[model samples]
Target: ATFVLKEFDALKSHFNDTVKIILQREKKDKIEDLPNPRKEELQFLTAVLNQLEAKIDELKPRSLASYVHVFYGAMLLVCKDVENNLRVMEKKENSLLFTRLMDGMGISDENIPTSEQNIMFYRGLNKFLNFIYESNDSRKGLKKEHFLQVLSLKKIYSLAKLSYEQEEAAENNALAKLTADGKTKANANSFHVEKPIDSSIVEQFKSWDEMKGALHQLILDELSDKNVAKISALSQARSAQLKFLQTMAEQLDKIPNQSLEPSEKMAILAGAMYIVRGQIAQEYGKDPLSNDKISATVIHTGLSTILHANADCCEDKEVLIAAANKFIRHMVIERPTKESVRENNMFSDIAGFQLISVLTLIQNMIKTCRTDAIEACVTKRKEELEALKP
Candidate 1:
């Protein structure tokens, strides 16, 4: 939830970046091209959305036009996200992400966007629409979900707070079920529904008016520093591509070689981990924005691009395991000048990243593993973690 970028303009870029990360890469001009999109990716996509959605109200603008503009744009992106994921969700070969996603975004059948919002959003998808039509079920392309607009700051706050409440409610419910069931996966509605989940989130805010009084002013404080609002290019720039490849390749190379000086090696990898988290040193590259080293932003960009050309291969257990192994490959064969090949490398690593960044990157990747073998591949690398200290 914290991953939600506070600015509205930057939100879609965050969505796109996440789409690329969760899916790990862009395969085609359109979402329909990929047959079996990874389930973890879409599910991750939802988590990403939920984070933003929970914060959606924080983005509400006071000016009516700005308010309407931001609202339309936000919902459109949300629809596109669901439409994009709706395809793989239907495949059912993989996860509960689709059903829950469908239920959340109107609905999905494992493939194809359902739900009124998703359907209309995709239809009027401007030019992105797969449907190529108009007058969608009698709703305007822009206001299909409900043509409501805010009359006051308080109203937007009320709406935004309501949204957050629902998002939290659903999430709490799911987590409670997962906790109840002991973590094995299952479809939506599969879990027994004995009672309503607790309302700690709802309890905290109490009401929309109260939320408005607090965060609305807080929103005003941040709006002045609105980097996204002032410089449209800020969001677009870093997202174009990551500059951390060299750093990743370098660290990945060092990971296998114990002789490379232990602290330095782990530090490099840790830097990459923290870079993905957006924490970085001062004075890194300005271009794709590096930090003095690995900021979480750079790291996220790096992870998305690490397997760049070979992204298609990450779809299932075998390839992700294969890719996962390649990173930890040498900590095999110890190819030093004595000689570990230190090969299959992504061109001579780039520059600048820090070791202070930590991982939990590895843990998530392992959790996303579709098979025991993939998990093993990650654990195999982890077994090497006795040496992770920097």
Candidate 2:
């Protein structure tokens, strides 16, 4: 999120040069070179320096797509050696040699490091020794500071690796779900193929215009029902919701296909919506809709279904506009009225406001829809209901 790869890309090659200076060996160099070094210690330093240089080398010039994992990997390598180098310096004999090495690097009182030199030295050093600078007064246990950093970096890259794998697996899983049934394969029987949920709904329709006609007819059917019975209201709302989803699915069908095969993205949308809104009465309240489990479940799925379909699919930009316009038209026809109040068995204000909440929720989730048009409809309806209120 913070563009971590870009920051790593801009790292100066100074760390590379610093490692070379530490390894440099020349006659009468300012630093007193270690002689007769212990077999293991000498091998250890050599191995780390080799790895440090290799890590730096591999970090150069890579694809941004691959860089997230690479950055953490490279830092982990560098961190290991930096911690190891600090351990090597802990030895009294090794400490004296590093003291001399500092002189050779031109860090001296007489030389008086220039501002630019000081900046470069600290910038290069902090990447390795930042843990050392943590003060005891403001500390969270200094005993394993380097270890903490390394541990975190190791996990960060591990998660990055996992994220890459998980995304690949999701696509595979979606594709697998679309393939012939696993049960049929196990039994050596006839295969049953599957398709997107939206596809099944579209299979019921003849053409785009016919589909639109069906959607409008459903809206008309809902409006023609003048019942104020809570169960009846729930049934009408749920049917309207199904029509909204079917219309959205059909619009996506009309769009140009970008893949050799359109995967189950529409199905995924439908499933996710169903899972998230597994309870409608819990969210929109049980008063107007009257908490019939069947109605609640249906309305819940429909709300989530239309919400996501409009949000994810239907890039044509007209799908939601048309859907919202039609939905609002239904709300307007079912709106509270003096005649309805006298009729007593007609649509109630409680049902009207609850439905308005559904329309408002849809508009909020998909901001690209005709927001002003919806607000105007909602505002006018609210005032009309307010005037009708006793």
Candidate 3:
């Protein structure tokens, strides 16, 4: 959630300097060893840089802090492409001078050709990348499941950003036309001097409002339906987890002026572990042996055992968080990275296949629980969850 402006600032400065150099070289008509900028090429670069600036600015008004992670991750991918392209270009040209120039730009000889190819690829890639980063659906607008598929994430984000920006631009253009046509009064809230109205204008306004209302009503009705109860419940639970995490973060802040004691840090981690445990339990059910009576030591031991038992089991977020916490805590206490904490080798004994089987069992049970809840609802909840899933 932390915003590191260093990357963005560095990229912005580099882009500006590059753009200025290109413009200066063009004005001087000095065809250097580097590729000369054509009129179209200069225009394209200008547009791309402007678009990037606008997208970065748009991030300022965004509400979701998690979005910055997605944005940065996508940016890294783009930069990697650029770097690879330049390397490829250098290799394809096979010019010692070009290779030297690339090296001067901090790119190694091996990377020059790849970097050139990356630059070419990214000319098109930028369009898609910008779309994802600046799109509304890429931000807060996507449904939960839609957000999960890592492959679709970039595509959806880019498309949504471009579409949303285009729509806003069109709307602004229309508004400007309206103002130019004297639709606005000299003073705010002054009585409007009416102009001859087109029948199409009236129809458009009525249709727009009608469709807007209908969409709003549809969403309201869907949310109110009994079938959506599971979605509502799960969403609430996730929100609770976020709240718990935030509380833990705040508690960590209150560890006095001195560094936190091992016990104090472990206590904070235990709270986080509990949230994870509760989440998994609610979503994946407790183990056959698990019950309210299980002591903290037993819970921790069971979780660690189950997690290390197999790679499949280790894939769960709850398991991973728990394991990571335990590892860090053990390292803090024992100062041994390789040393085993527990006497038994329960974690190392299990196979990945077996762990997957256990996970499947838990998943089936969770599905069954949700199914029962849906059946209990008087209305069709299954259809609601289905619609919401995508």
Candidate 4:
């Protein structure tokens, strides 16, 4: 992962190489004189480069890792935009075939300068192509194959996956500190490694049902409307519930047979459940999956039972299986009614999709210890959520 950051300059060098190719092909020494798409392509590249450079300068001494992190984020957004444009250009009503033929010829339907050569000329238009589709097949413009391949090869999905893990870890650590002994604060440097929840608490959770009950009660006590009236009460209640969930998560981590450390497994369960709640909220709009606290508490509780039941072997596999079963149980097998589909968007497509999606990433993270598959699922889930918004 750090390799991308370490070779950050190399990406710039490739960008410069692309610029030279553009100028040489256009027979123009300057970007300003380059025709339509070429000019816009260079402009986009220059803009992104300037942004990343400024970011790097600002984060210079201590945060090189974050540079690589943001680079993946930046790349994914750019590639997604490129993919969208490519789709629009492929629409049948756009006269796309004739348009492409003329753009490739650098002419209009009337034989004037088309200025429509958006995808032709320099490959610099999309940096992904410059990196992935390395060939002399210069005549063929950006293909979907090329675009999709770059996204896969770049593993841009890791952007979301790892961030989720890190966020989960941070939240857990913060709650751990908040719940720590009153006289001493948890060490600030120990942010990533979780402070052990008390063994007595861990041992108290004898079964998933008991843990689930405790979690539900904790959420009720802390996050319910009645309990959230005062800031002090809210913080205190939040700390209390956070500790209970972390304790429950760590208890779930005992269902062995797969990879991932204790804290990480706990983080995966906690984080993936949050994403599930978010997707559900997005799909059903204001009230169905209304509040974050209730859904996370309930879903995680239900899934913990499934996780325990199916978890005789391969913890990662069990996570995936539980995820699949939970979706089936909620959306298909045990849904409210056969008319559930038309009744409303309560069990919308996205809710199930994200449940499976994040769990798959959780499995991947468990098996491979990487977030390489997280971003794409998150991206797709977001699109579905936006489209299904009420």
Best by lDDT: 4
Regions of model 1 farther than 4 Å from truth: 1-146, 180-298, 304-390
Superior candidate under lDDT, 1 versus 2: 2
lDDT per residue, candidate 1, 168-189, as tens digits? 3332332232211122221212
Better of 2 and 4 by TM-score: 4
| lDDT tens per residue, model 4, 1-390 | 111122456556655675676688668988778754335435544555665676567667464444433333333333333334454346523532223322332333344311111211111222222221224121222223432331332233432233344333432332232221122222212223223332322232354445456545645644565446432354442343344345335434454423223433333343334334334344445322223333543433343433342222222332433333233223222222121222222123222132223333333333222231233233544575579888
- Per TM-score, the best of the predicted structures is 4
How many Å off is the CA of 315 in candidate 4? 30
lDDT (10s digit) by residue, model 3, range 73-142: 2333333333344643455245333332233233443333232233333233323333422242222223
Model 3, residue 263: C-alpha shift (Å): 37
TM-score per candidate? 0.17, 0.23, 0.23, 0.29
In candidate 2, what are the lDDT values of residues 286-382, reduced to their tens digit? Answer: 4222223434343343443343332333222223333333323332322221101112211132232233344333333333222222233334444
Q: Sum up the clashes in candidate 2.
A: 0
**lDDT winner, 3 or 4:** 4
Score residue 316 of candidate 4 by CA lDDT.
37
> Which scores greater on lDDT, model 1 or model 3?
3
Candidate 3 global TM-score:
0.23
Model 4 weakest 10-residue run by lDDT: 114-123
Off by over 4 Å in 3: 1-10, 26-52, 55-390
